[PDB]
């Protein structure tokens, strides 16, 4: 078999797998299947210039016919609502080729949106209309003594998510399905771990974002929302196309991608147009599981299934926190830093740069192609006697034959050291008489530091 360390990596890499199986008695839909589900109405703004340009207005007065809507007292968005709305708009503009510009309807635009508040509960907490309706672009928000959620929207709270959600609706995203409960959902991933359009809590899919008495809501489009809006309007490859850090020490310039404290509750899906990117979760003390696979989920900041990388996005680096984390790279050359604590790092393909950090770390390899002589991983701070190079997924615990020179026998391995403080582990898995696997290190590696 393999070690527990490999099994932990493998299990996590597949933990959130989607499609072709039932979950909660419902079909599991892949992100693409959900993108179809979320755009099933066929409604969308139309271009052309290749980009949809919408204008929007925070109404200062009730439109003609307003009183017949039964919404009660009309009121303009406060400065705080406008500020948050603009952030929500931006979060959609960031991922899809649609822009929002404050201003009255204009002949040159592709559509016009309005925002305003109403006071009569009978209207609902908030609502919006699809872009093919007579009230295309409109979204309305309830505010009265009995319902105060929309009066103070802010990063992470439902008021901000409501703005994001209603706008997603004005863009053409439907709610995931048609007292209903998650039981009536069409597919398993109909929860707010996957889409801000869902009415159901992440608890239904097992993720944990917060506890009773506290609110925790993604302020920006989540994984499936990004796929859905991009299916409608095209991916916006221009955003953050330069090098970007998400999380702690964020350089994304977005409130929902920034962490400044260990208690921060991050719930976001990373969209990026290119650049050597990093997921920095160094400031957390809780166990984390970071997956750099595109379209995959990570357990971050003491929560689970709360961070994801959008389909089509390549993230190159990850920095774990002080807990005992799992770090999973992708095919690209990744720089993975464990942090304090005992981490299990799996570079994947390409020539990775691995930092175990303090603590006792395990560097897992699941295939020979993971670390070849022509593209060898380098463990930058290997600590003999504490860290481990785990090849059990390859050897299946068959063991290795440590020799000073390859004999032509499969399984022969050579541990070397150069007193540039550089070590290396070479292996001839295929038995060709030469190394087909190579891992270099800064710091000595001993035969007893290898699990095979």
Residues 277-316 close enough to bind Ca ion by CB under 5 A: 277, 314
Q: Is 370 in the site for Ca ion (CB under 5 A)?
A: yes
Residues 311-330 close enough to bind Ca ion by CB under 5 A: 314, 320, 325, 329
Q: Is 240 in the site for Ca ion (CB under 5 A)?
A: yes
Q: Is 165 annotated as a binding residue?
A: yes
| Identified binder of Ca ion from the candidate list 153, 156, 221, 357, rule CB under 5 A | 357
Q: Which helix (H) or strand (E) holds 167?
A: helix 158-171
Q: Is 412 in the site for Ca ion (CB under 5 A)?
A: no
DSSP-derived 3-state class of residue 123: helix
Q: Which residues pair with 100 in a beta bridge?
A: 54
Q: Is 343 in the site for Ca ion (CB under 5 A)?
A: yes
Using an 8 Å Cβ cutoff, are 229 and 171 in contact?
Answer: yes
Q: How long is the chain?
A: 452
Q: Is 275 in the site for Ca ion (CB under 5 A)?
A: yes
Q: Is 381 annotated as a binding residue?
A: no
Q: Which of 138, 155, 166, 189 is catalytic?
A: 166
Q: Which two tokens stand for residue 420?
A: 């540039």
Q: Is 172 annotated as a binding residue?
A: no
Q: Is 234 in the site for Ca ion (CB under 5 A)?
A: no
Ranked by CB distance to Ca ion, the top (closest) residue is: 275
Q: Which two tokens stand for residue 189?
A: 């991933």
CA 371/CA 366 separation, integer angstroms: 10
Q: Is 377 in the site for Ca ion (CB under 5 A)?
A: yes
Using an 8 Å Cβ cutoff, are 360 and 325 in contact?
Answer: no
Question: What is the nearest approach in angstroms of Ca ion to the Cβ of residue 280?
Answer: 12
Q: Is 224 in the site for Ca ion (CB under 5 A)?
A: no
Q: Is 24 annotated as a binding residue?
A: no
Q: Is 377 annotated as a binding residue?
A: yes
Alpha helices in 282-425, H assignment, sequence order: 392-395
Which lies closer to Ca ion via its Cβ, residue 370 or residue 412? 370
Q: Is 114 annotated as a binding residue?
A: no
Is 166 catalytic? The answer is yes
Q: Is 183 annotated as a binding residue?
A: no
Q: Which two tokens stand for residue 334?
A: 């990744």
Q: Which two tokens stand for residue 434?
A: 């030469």
Q: Which two tokens stand for residue 376?
A: 């060898």
Q: Is 239 in the site for Ca ion (CB under 5 A)?
A: no
Binding segment for Ca ion (CB under 5 A), chosen from 33-41, 72-80, 373-381, 397-405, is 373-381
Residues annotated within the binding site are 47, 49, 51, 53, 110, 165-166, 169, 175, 240, 242, 244, 272, 274-275, 277, 314, 316, 321, 323, 325, 330, 332, 334, 338-341, 343, 347-350, 352, 356-359, 361, 370, 377, 387
Binding stretches for Ca ion (CB under 5 A) = 240, 244, 272, 275, 277, 314, 320, 325, 329, 334, 338-339, 341, 343, 347-348, 350, 352, 356-357, 359, 361, 370-371, 377
Q: Among all residues, which ones are annotated catalytic? A: 166
């Amino acid at each position: 078999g393999t070690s527990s360390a490999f099994t932990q990596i493998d299990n996590f890499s597949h933990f959130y797998d989607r499609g072709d199986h039932l979950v909660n008695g419902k079909p599991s839909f892949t992100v693409d299947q959900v993108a179809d589900q979320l755009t099933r109405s066929g409604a969308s703004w139309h271009d052309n210039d290749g980009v949809i340009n919408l204008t929007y207005t925070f109404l200062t007065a009730p439109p003609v016919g307003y009183a017949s809507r039964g919404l009660g007292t009309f009121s303009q968005f406060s400065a705080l609502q406008k500020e948050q709305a603009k952030l929500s708009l931006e979060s959609w503009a960031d991922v899809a080729k649609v822009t929002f510009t404050e201003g009255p309807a204009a002949r040159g635009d592709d559509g016009h949106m309005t925002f305003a508040n109403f006071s009569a509960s009978n209207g609902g907490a908030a609502f919006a209309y699809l872009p093919n309706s007579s009230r295309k672009g409109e979204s309305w928000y309830l505010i009265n003594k009995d319902y105060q959620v929309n009066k103070t929207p802010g990063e992470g709270n439902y008021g901000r998510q409501t703005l994001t959600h209603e706008i997603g609706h004005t863009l053409g995203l439907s709610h995931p399905g048609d007292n209903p409960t998650y039981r009536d959902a069409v597919y398993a991933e109909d929860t707010r771990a996957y889409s801000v359009m869902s009415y159901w809590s992440e608890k239904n899919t097992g993720q944990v974002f917060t506890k009773t008495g506290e609110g925790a809501y993604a302020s920006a489009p989540l994984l499936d929302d990004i796929a859905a809006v991009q299916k409608l309007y095209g991916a916006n490859l221009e955003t953050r196309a330069d090098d970007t850090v998400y999380g702690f020490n964020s350089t994304a310039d977005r409130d929902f991608y920034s962490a400044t404290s260990s208690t921060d509750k991050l719930i976001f899906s990373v969209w990026d147009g290119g650049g050597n990117d990093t997921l920095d979760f160094s400031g957390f003390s809780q166990n984390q599981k970071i997956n750099l696979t595109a379209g995959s989920f990570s357990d971050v900041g003491g929560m689970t299934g709360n961070v994801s990388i959008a389909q089509g996005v390549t993230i190159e680096n990850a920095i774990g926190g002080s807990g005992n984390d799992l770090l999973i790279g992708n095919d690209a050359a990744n720089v993975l830093k464990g942090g304090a604590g005992n981490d299990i790092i799996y570079g994947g393909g390409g020539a990775d740069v691995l930092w175990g950090g303090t603590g006792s770390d395990t560097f897992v390899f699941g295939a020979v192609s993971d670390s070849t002589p022509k593209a060898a991983d380098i463990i930058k701070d290997f600590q003999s006697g504490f860290d481990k190079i785990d090849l059990t997924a390859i050897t299946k615990l068959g063991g290795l034959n440590f020799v000073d020179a390859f004999t032509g026998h499969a399984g022969d391995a050579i541990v070397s050291y150069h007193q540039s403080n550089a070590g290396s582990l070479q292996v001839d898995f295929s038995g060709q008489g030469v190394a087909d696997f190579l891992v270099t290190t800064v710091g000595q590696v001993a035969t007893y530091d290898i699990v095979a």
